[model samples]
Target chain A: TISEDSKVSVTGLPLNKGPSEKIKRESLWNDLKTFLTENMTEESNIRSTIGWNEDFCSACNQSGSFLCCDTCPKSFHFLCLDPPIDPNNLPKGDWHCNECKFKIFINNSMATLKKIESNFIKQNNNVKIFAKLLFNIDSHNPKQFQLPNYIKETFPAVKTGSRGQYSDENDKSYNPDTHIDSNSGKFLICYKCNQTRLGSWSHPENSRLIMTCDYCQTPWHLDCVPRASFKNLGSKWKCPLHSPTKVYKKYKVWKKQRLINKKNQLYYEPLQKIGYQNNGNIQIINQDFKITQIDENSIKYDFFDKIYKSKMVQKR
Target chain B: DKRRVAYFYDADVGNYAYGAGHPMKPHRIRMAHSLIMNYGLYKKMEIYRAKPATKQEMCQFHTDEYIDFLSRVTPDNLEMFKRESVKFNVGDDCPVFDGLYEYCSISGGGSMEGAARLNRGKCDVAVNYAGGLHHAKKSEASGFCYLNDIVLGIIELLRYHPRVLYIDIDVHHGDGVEEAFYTTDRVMTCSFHKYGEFFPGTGELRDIGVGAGKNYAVNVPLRDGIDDATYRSVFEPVIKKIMEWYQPSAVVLQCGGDSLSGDRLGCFNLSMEGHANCVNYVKSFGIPMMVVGGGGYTMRNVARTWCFETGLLNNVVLDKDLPYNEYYEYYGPDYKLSVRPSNMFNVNTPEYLDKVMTNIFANLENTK
Candidate 1:
């Protein structure tokens, strides 16, 4: 018989032990209800169910049946729609639900517990021993679940700033010499390099007073660091390990490419000058050169050669 | 009679002059009338002679003090029109001309008559090329404008139509009209003018409308060098949107030729074809529309553009070249473009209209 409390009592247990088991069972039941309520609200399943109407699909304009795809918000009806999926293969236990697609692990542990209880009674063994064995098995084979792979990939965590929050400070301690007031025993922390030193001594030329990353030396400060944990690191500080030397090689290559571009621009300047002279008679010469008038027809050839020679000399 | 359209012009209308060196010359109106007559538009259309507006009608848009000031001033007391006039900013723009009150009253009355004709359904479309002095405020004169003829005409239209959309394609902003209906929901005033680089520059895109007229007063303040293609793209969409939203009973188109390419005062480079295209596009709506001339400095260009528009509206086509032999002395030998329009009666719908629609849609998307 079900009471108003709706708690079930297990008979044949010691009088004191029965109350404890009943209390544990009630607590577990409350926890399960809380978990379901939390997940349902977060997934917006409750609101969806309340607002669901058979004729709500604007696309199909059908009544009585609606189908929302697992990946999309658009709703379509089953029979009226041209594209159809087999109803026989409808998802059941531990399936990914539409909208949120939260994975649910099947509770085979409950079935295992029930089987063990029946077997223990038949075999004339103690219920406590059977319960202990079942508990161990359940704990060992706890069902693990995660959101769908697509969901995780689509909603990637946004990295707002530098990696100072995840820096391992145990290996390096703060250096007091680099602080703003060295006599005061204060230290400045370089957010990018994650190096802690006397505040005034560390990169004094930089007006921002930000730190560079260990590998790249990219500047950052306390506020600039992403996902920083204040609760763990109360007052002590340390520097993070530097990034690999390969990054500096890539930087050098980029610098070389920029220099090459500048050289190319220099080489094209005289050629551009000659082209302008040919189009119009306005020739731009440097202060060192003297303008000499020649026959109009021959001026083009002479100007082109002079420009070409100047460019060759620049290249050498 | 289908009551197509009518225009009022007389030599008397041109006799009123605003002193020497004043920009609002009497010759401007005379040139407009000559062009209208040269195209042979007078024969097909109802032409009325000029008449001064009644004292009661003049008071509808002007203050009593301002009207009295115009009435009493003379060349001897020209300093009086200049001194007390500073409050209204009337002296420079609204100078002490001969028969100043009567001439302005006549132009205002002609505009009122055009509006009255539109209201009574006597004509589906009518134009007062002398009117559209929109810079005149209720109590002040501005920008060589003495009377707010465009606003008065619109106010008259509001008696029958619940909504009247006033479009001003002037080079300068139609500030006075926008100010009058700034708080009224009944009238939607849209102006596309040159801003940032044009004089009397106040129109900005964000100045949509205030209070009841919010989002109704759409101002597409364009930059200089806005050619025919760009004008069509920017303006047509706005017109279409207004038509859709307001469904105005009538449209008052202030077709100021200053937006044309070669007008000395006009900063833009729009062809005469562009101006005509705007007029034709408005006519296609089939609503009762009042077409009025506004600021166009170059006399010859204004005459040609407005006359071309009048011909287009009346279903008459003048020759592309100079149609009249008498008008040849006014324009020199270099003036060539066969005024005899080969296809006079035909209306040429512009091609590449889809490009304009697409541009408008893109702008709407950006705003959204």
Candidate 2:
């Protein structure tokens, strides 16, 4: 019969299973604890986060499987993540859950170990994060953003400086403008849309979003703006925003082959490193400049999913 | 001439909402504007409510056909544009919002107007909180930005100023702007951003521009968890070297509030004071500077950073008490000007920063 205490393995852990010579050894919980000394972020990140409650799903307000925001209490059911997520596909570490998804963001903010008392009344458990805002820059999730490879072949020149915040066009140096709320200024409405918040509103209280004239400060509504004029507004939208004339300076010829050809030698690195240029009147160089362009034909898009255009534009 | 700072903000751009939970909320811009107004910074500057830009202006860098499409596309007619949106690089990163075209036009206008005023010496500094949409390409939108206002403004500045210094502290690379002037020696684009597996993944310290533009493109690529000390240490010295050798005529500083602590989509552990210090240090040069907003997902922090920066520009020492205004509700309990939140670790270690700093200084020296 085996003794009650069993045998101690070479690693000093319990190994009381199977045959005598070939015993089965299991690493103690404390032994493995040494290997996982402590990763502060993993301890307090969103799902395992500190500041907020971690009891249930923030989206459905229930229990079971859920993906928690690494920076906040905004949890979501993997099944609730738009297209749904699979359990076997659990991320290795630092899962962002859509709401708070940036690599360094979770680690940087969660590094703060200060504990805060819970504010919500969920029985008696207190959540612990201080300020729960996030600072993410998620470009790796390319199912989203980008820049073309040939972006290194373009133009130049630029800066500006002056005054305080939004420099006052007119003020009492301290007096707040009356034309701020609902009925302070002129009732210049977008006759086309018929609402008061057309071209430009008096203040943010009424409507914060609006496009107006730089010269006359005339508020132009969404409908008032024209086609093709969208991209070149900086070039001069006033022409279109103003009288019969729409464009300015005409379509400038691609201007110059090189934004500025450095005196001569060419737009790129000269080919003389390998040896010398062939003896010829032309004096050809192996390198002179680089070239890049996006494309020819373009596509038209809308803000929302649905639309109705004329025959000239056609359907998708 | 007397000192003046030009101010530019278009309210409409702020109303934009990119889908439901998209990080780039144009609305936060409204919060920033409201805070600045309450602080009374707006009263001190020369305001330029720029008119919408024209076809010629937008096409300065954007393709003509792309411009034509934006003019009329709306949500009601998006199915027709499904294919178009993908090709234009407009998807999750830069989702189509309600005022897609309008946002682009007015945002670009503010930057151009600032550049125009700077050219004519209308102010000592110009602040356009909505114009530093640096990631937008000539014909495509990226990083919650639909337009390259920084580029358009820089082009306008190039018309008169010979040497323009474009500094970006937005936590992401100013890829569009840098790539735009990548081949020219006239513009020096320096970006202090988080590199490696980050958004739009460009701006390695080694990517210091090429050809005639070699050494002109300065990149201070750091790892995650950078703090104020390291930021100032690297930022100040690099800029000092730039001012000594390059002698830039104008400066366009992209202030992305996301670099601050607790941001929704940022990495570095910066505070309001650290962010403003970057602005104030650059301002000390008294160079013609155009300050434009960039990436900052946390709305409250973005508002604070821009407000503090605005105050710095006006030379106004704002009180800790947020003045009584409509935006009072937004500040909540801590209605203060500058905040010193607990900082994060410095991933760009002293040893690593020393190496990165030395490399950039060498690049700047090469420019000479």
Candidate 3:
């Protein structure tokens, strides 16, 4: 059963809200009220409530209108009115007039309406998250807080923006740029920055800004130092990194150091025989024939094999 | 080209069958191929190699957990089976052989590919001789099968053709395929098998499907010693009635050779001619068909029956006298003398065949 205070609160909330919001709430409330009223008069609900109405004939929709009269103990009486009738001696312990029955009906109807309103509010909250997602608005903000149950139930489809700016019609022909560092030692230099700093230093943010050298048709970052411009230009400008007259000398010094380090690392291994002449070139003596009594350093065989071979020779 | 059928058969199909000692021997499919070739079926049909089915595609019918169990049964990953493999029923009947998962997957792929060929209208009919593994359930394996290729094929067919009729003529019941479509009216399964006495015996006369699928599962559980005459009498009329009732877009026939007489494992004594007649009857329906090879133990009889059925479907019935030299060489040069005497059907149409047909109509009328 619903209390009168709760019913008053439900009807009063819309009066405090804005006109548009009040109208929307009232429309939903009316739908809830209509559902309750239709279900309350149904036989399934009537049978579940109070005792059975045996006096009310289903065929003619008539009742004898007798309270504790005749054979039946419980029955409706036609004489039970505000203004007493001629036959007023009706046995009554606890009786309900038409107005009292109508009141009970209203209470049951209001209780069912309250349940439907709670369900509607829960569903509406879920639709709010779906609306936020559709508009691409921030969904995690406290002001955008929606009921957890609502967020779980609603699964409306939403559209994000275009796939990306670089989207292509012919996908097979589109080639994404590689993320390799070409500036390191022994690494191949980028075609865009020939003889200048490698192109690998360009991050995602830097890749957007275009740079080109007029002479070789090559490109490099503006931050590639001395010959390059470090300051950000308000408008577009050509590369000042390379001039036709001046050849930078620092690149030559760095190239020399790189080659020397590579040469020193190569000294750990001997040079090939094809690159040098041997002292004994005249009909080389049979190496295997002379190795019958070879020294430990000269023989390729390990110490264990040499000792085993010596033991076999001694037995023979 | 004269309404040719496509069959996905290759060395891989023969290799997929179990080893020499296993019931599903490697030679079974090879023998079927050789028999079909000996009957000169190559001129009438096109052959295609089977492609493997992917994991996502198989997930349409099978549960994810069961498929995951199969994936982990590799040689290097045998330790994964120590815990949940038996619980998932992956070890007993469906043992983890060297390439068990790959073999079953390839077989299933062949069936799906055959269905796709039918769907694309590339061929009027397709026979996956290595498929029809019908004892496998949705989540577990039963009998000597691991995956239900028939169910997967039906699922593939349902994509294009809304209604399909699956007819199982194996000696044992087609329990797996029937169970898969027991609730859906989209596929009508009619199984004629030795019901009361067979492995996985469950298809009873009164076991009509539930829900919207009621009366769709028609089971004609026959008794043993059901000869060719009796078998044909029951099937021909029942299939004609089914054609009227269902009006299916396509038909899938599971031609298990165990229904043939003299089969080591078969209880019924249906001769090779009787078995071949069943296939011919289905072919005469003129609907696009998929004939799959199923349980057959007596290798020689199964081979001869399937070969004869293939010949009949192509409208090139061979003479009773054995013609090919390879048959003599394979079965034996001396074995021909023994085979010819007993195997040949003397009558063009047996007299008992009419009596059997009368009895079949009587049974149907009685039921009505």
Best by lDDT: 2
lDDT of each: 0.60, 0.65, 0.60
A1-316 per-residue lDDT for model 2 (tens digits): 7576755755444565534433334333330121111221111111110112386665555565456665666667666565566655656786664434543444445543332112222323443232222111232321211224233223221111131122122121111332233365665444344444422234332331223445455555432332111222123334234333222346533222323223333433333332223211122222533322212121123212224445336754
Model 2 CA deviation exceeding 4 Å by range: A1-316
* Chain B TM-score list for all models: 0.87, 0.96, 0.87
Chain A superposition TM-score, candidate 3: 0.13
Which 10-residue span in candidate 1 chain B carries the lowest summed lDDT? B340-349
Clash number for candidate 3: 6
Q: Which candidate would rank higher by TM-score, 1 or 3? A: 1
Off by over 4 Å in 1: A1-316, B1-3, B81-83, B334-368
- How well does each candidate reproduce the native contacts, as fnat? 0.00, 0.00, 0.00
Cα error, residue A274 of model 1, in Å, equals 67
Query: At residue B310, what lDDT does model 2 achieve?
Result: 84
lDDT over C-alpha atoms for residue A162 of model 1: 38
The best candidate by TM-score is 2
- What TM value does chain B of candidate 1 have? 0.87
Residue range B21-63, candidate 1, lDDT tens digits? 5545556667666666655666567665434465557677788
Q: What does candidate 1's lDDT look like per residue over A151-223, in tens digits?
A: 3333233111232132222222223333343345544555554555233335332222234343343334532
Better of 1 and 2 by TM-score: 2
Candidate 3, residues B51-126, lDDT tens digits: the string is: 6676766677888887877776765676546545656676555566677777777777788888877887878788
